[PDB]
Ligand binder design. Structure first.
Ligand SMILES: CN1c2c(nc(N)[nH]c2=O)NC[C@@H]1CNc1ccc(C(=O)N[C@@H](CCC(=O)O)C(=O)O)cc1
Ligand SMILES: [Zn+2]
Length: 733
């Protein structure tokens, strides 16, 4: 009988209980005991769910109040001193590191540690931060979270497998603090290993027989000298006095690093065969006698019902290489990255809901697959699964002939402007006559809003009253900008709740959930859109508010759009067609929008792709350069239908060559000399500080726009700043 395994379970709660209790604790409404009681109730509920589903290997220490990497930093005393001088008990040191700390000496405003994207998932972890003076050690009176949680589950009669981030990944994903700029985190390895060993011994003494030790940096391009550290670390940790170690990898391909793990004393490995099924043969063939192979075949980052027949076949290949006794059916990664429970959806059509599985359902999928490859009769589940998979692949939701046919029209001309920039600029100058050092802003501006969204969705106020409120907000914002004297304006987007869902709602091919929440960072969660089929845009999405904003001023009003790659990356994508295809479909839908904007007189249009870098494939090579090419192609498909006098803008927070590939008229960036398309380097503060910072960037005149850093912060600050920025632009004129 082949075992089933889950690498981690989302902890937010089916009703976002974790968010509610933590935010209550932070605002003084709940006590720390109330906090802890809710956490314990969440963990117990999630363990019992997993046991009842029949999962064999059930994780502990996957729970967190904020972030699991932060939890380890607190456990190992990677705590910078500044957080320690306020008499905070350890759980409050933890929160102080995660979210910062303010006290009424002058006031304290101690900033949080940095938030970092966890690989290419949509989760963010708190950066481990080390100094030359870091003394790594266990903190017994803080409680040892993985020991305590292991024991809690055991007392419920649930044997679990503690999960911790391994020492190489933990140090390598961390960074040197300000006061220790030359420190290489990985150099700290000999100092941290004794703390890992101690932790593992305490887990063993409590009854833990296996531990999942995550080494996800093995899917990254690692220097050779980092590669050798795996043999060192794991030779030091393995022994009679510790649990068996299952070295766990996800999100990518470990083959370039196989030599690093081919002679390890660990008890087994886990690999992600959803993202990289093709590494199976080579990773299997380095397993030593006795080592087990955990085959990650149930996607931990997407919401589609698994094809039981294909997932079992992947598992059956593993079984053929190393033996039925040495394979485990697993989720590809932690279920951290999926929503909690499909059964909470109250509005989804049953046809569509038949195609999905969220975390709770994925528990049943790993069990049924495990039974299937072990020889049990599960033909009824197999048949029902095959029926769902079949229905999806034949549905019209998925296949729209017009979109298919439109994809066949994509070619170079469709992704190229009618003329090159220099010629375009001469028509743009005749049209706008913008003065040199033109001034604009990047988008957002500074209460009552949701109040009016609300009575409108319940039909209490007409579309008529709703529109006048929107238009009054737009009005305020436009007049404010005019009185400051900005040259190119924005409307403020009071009509928009969310950069991606605002578009997804208005596009075919999308479905939406009531409860599909995923933790993004801390207590902040996202409810991503789902791409279910071929995307098209039946009609104008933004034209109305932009046309109204443009009508009350003789300054150029920017249209504002989100790009195709960002819409794709902050949605749950289809798993039946490539990312590329989904991006080009989005490019084409956005092209209709850009063209309608231009048609309605909105001939300055900003299109932002803030997710481009998060989507970078994890290793260098063909997949990465293909991604950068199609990403840019998709942007150009959206923006290349316009006349020469229409001005495409794009704004970047974050590689100059990719930016160049977009051929935008104006790029706002928050030493590429021979590049004609114009740039606004972000400046935001004195008029003279402005005067200084521009003067020094001087060291090209006709090419510089002036603008802030990213969206706007209180009215007096924005005003004073914006007004100072404009004054500075005028001197130079
Ligand atoms: C800009 N970001 C973003 C994204 N993904 C999506 N889909 N949308 C986004 O705006 N990924 C990267 C980053 C994530 N940052 C954030 C920041 C705040 C909240 C947030 O405030 N969430 C609210 C719920 C908002 C709502 O009502 O939907 C919360 O309090 O949990 C979420 C993600
Ligand atoms: Zn920005």
């Amino acid at each position: 009988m082949v075992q089933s395994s889950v690498l981690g379970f989302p902890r937010i709660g089916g009703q976002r209980e974790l968010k509610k209790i933590t935010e209550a604790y932070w605002s003084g409404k709940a006590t720390v005991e109330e906090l802890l009681a809710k956490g314990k109730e969440l963990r117990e509920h999630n363990w019992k769910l997993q046991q009842k589903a029949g999962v064999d290997i059930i994780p502990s220490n996957d729970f967190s109040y904020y972030d699991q990497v932060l939890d380890l930093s607190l456990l190992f005393n990677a705590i910078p001193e500044r957080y320690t001088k306020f008499d905070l008990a350890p759980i409050d040191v933890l929160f102080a590191m995660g979210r910062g700390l303010q006290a009424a000496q002058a006031a304290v405003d101690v900033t949080a540690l940095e938030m970092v994207k966890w690989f290419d998932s949509n989760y963010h972890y708190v950066r481990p931060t080390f100094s030359h003076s870091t003394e790594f050690k266990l903190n017994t009176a803080a409680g040892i979270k993985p020991v305590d949680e292991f024991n809690e589950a055991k007392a419920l009669g649930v044997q679990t497998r503690p999960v911790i981030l391994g020492p190489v990944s933990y140090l390598y994903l961390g960074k040197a603090d300000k006061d220790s700029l030359d420190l290489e985190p990985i150099s700290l390895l000999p100092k941290i290993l004794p703390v890992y060993k101690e932790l593992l011994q305490k887990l063993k003494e409590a009854g833990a027989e296996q531990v999942q030790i995550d080494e996800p940096v093995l899917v990254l391009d690692l220097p050779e000298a980092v590669q050798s550290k795996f043999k060192e670390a794991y030779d030091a940790l393995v022994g009679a006095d510790v649990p068996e170690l299952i070295l766990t990898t996800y999100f990518g391909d470990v083959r370039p690093n196989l030599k690093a793990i081919e002679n390890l004393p660990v008890a087994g490995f886990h690999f992600d065969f959803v993202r990289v099924p093709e590494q199976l043969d080579e990773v299997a063939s380095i397993l030593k006698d006795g080592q087990t192979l955990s085959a990650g075949v149930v996607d931990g980052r997407n919401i589609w019902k698994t094809d039981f027949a294909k997932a079992s076949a992947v598992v059956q290949k593993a079984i053929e290489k190393v033996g039925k006794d040495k394979v485990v059916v697993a989720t590809s990664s932690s279920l951290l990255h999926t929503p909690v429970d499909l059964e909470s959806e109250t509005k989804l059509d049953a046809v569509i809901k038949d195609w999905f599985s969220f975390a709770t359902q994925k528990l049943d999928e790993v069990v049924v697959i495990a039974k299937n490859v072990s020889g049990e009769d599960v033909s009824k589940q197999l048949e029902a699964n095959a029926a769902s998979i079949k229905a999806r692949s034949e549905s019209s939701i998925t296949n729209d002939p017009k979109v298919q046919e439109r994809l066949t029209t994509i070619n170079e001309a469709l992704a190229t402007r009618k003329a090159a920039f220099p010629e375009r600029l001469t028509e743009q100058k005749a049209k706008y006559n913008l003065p040199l050092f033109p001034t604009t802003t990047i988008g957002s501006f500074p209460k009552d809003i949701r109040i009016n969204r609300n009575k409108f969705a319940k039909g209490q106020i007409t579309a008529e009253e709703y529109e006048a409120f929107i238009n009054k907000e737009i009005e305020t914002v436009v007049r404010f900008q005019e009185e400051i004297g900005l040259d190119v304006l924005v409307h403020g987007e009071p009509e928009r709740n969310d950069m991606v869902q605002y578009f997804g709602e208005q596009l075919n091919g999308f479905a939406f959930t009531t409860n599909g929440w995923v933790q993004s960072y801390g207590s902040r969660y996202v409810r991503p859109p789902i791409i279910v089929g071929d995307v098209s845009r039946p009609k104008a999405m933004t034209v109305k508010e932009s046309v109204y904003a443009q009508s009350i001023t003789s300054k150029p009003m920017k249209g504002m759009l989100t790009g195709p790659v960002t819409i794709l990356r902050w949605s749950f994508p289809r798993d039946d067609v490539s990312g590329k295809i989904q991006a080009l479909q989005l490019g084409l839908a956005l092209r209709d929008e850009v063209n309608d904007l231009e048609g309605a007189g909105i001939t300055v249009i900003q299109v932002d792709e803030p997710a481009i870098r998060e989507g970078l494939p994890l290793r260098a090579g063909k997949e990465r350069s293909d991604y950068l090419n199609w990403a840019a192609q998709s942007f150009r498909v959206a923006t290349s239908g316009v006349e020469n006098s229409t001005q495409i803008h794009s704004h970047f927070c974050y590689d100059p060559n990719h930016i160049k590939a977009l051929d935008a008229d104006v790029v706002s960036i928050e030493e590429f000399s021979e590049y004609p398309n114009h740039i606004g380097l972000g400046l935001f503060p004195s008029k003279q500080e402005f005067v200084s910072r521009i003067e020094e960037i001087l060291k090209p005149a006709s090419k510089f726009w002036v603008n802030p850093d990213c969206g706007l912060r209180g009215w007096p600050e924005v005003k004073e700043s914006l007004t100072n920025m404009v004054e500075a632009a005028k001197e130079f004129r």
